[PDB]
Write a protein that binds this DNA or RNA. Structure first.
Ligand SMILES: [Ca+2]
Ligand SMILES: [Ca+2]
Length: 67
DNA sequence: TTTTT
């Protein structure tokens, strides 16, 4: 898994960006977020994830909120 | 559902 931090998340529309030191930001949609219920992320949150080729370039997958 | 082509 890669380790990063949520750069941006649009709480309303369910997407954002994960920043990874020395790498390009990675796009995250709510559907990638693991866990039950409403799926969301706050800026600054540490996450673990992988990158997948979506329809339109790389996107985050299997995103988990870390301490 | 992009900072997507
Ligand atoms: Ca790792
Ligand atoms: Ca936000």
């Amino acid at each position: 898994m890669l380790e990063g931090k949520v750069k941006w998340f649009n709480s309303e529309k369910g997407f954002g960006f994960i920043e990874v030191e020395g790498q390009d930001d990675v796009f995250v949609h709510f559907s990638a977020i693991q866990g039950e219920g409403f799926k969301t992320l706050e800026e600054g949150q540490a996450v673990s994830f992988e990158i997948v080729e979506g329809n339109r370039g790389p996107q985050a997958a299997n995103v988990t909120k870390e301490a």
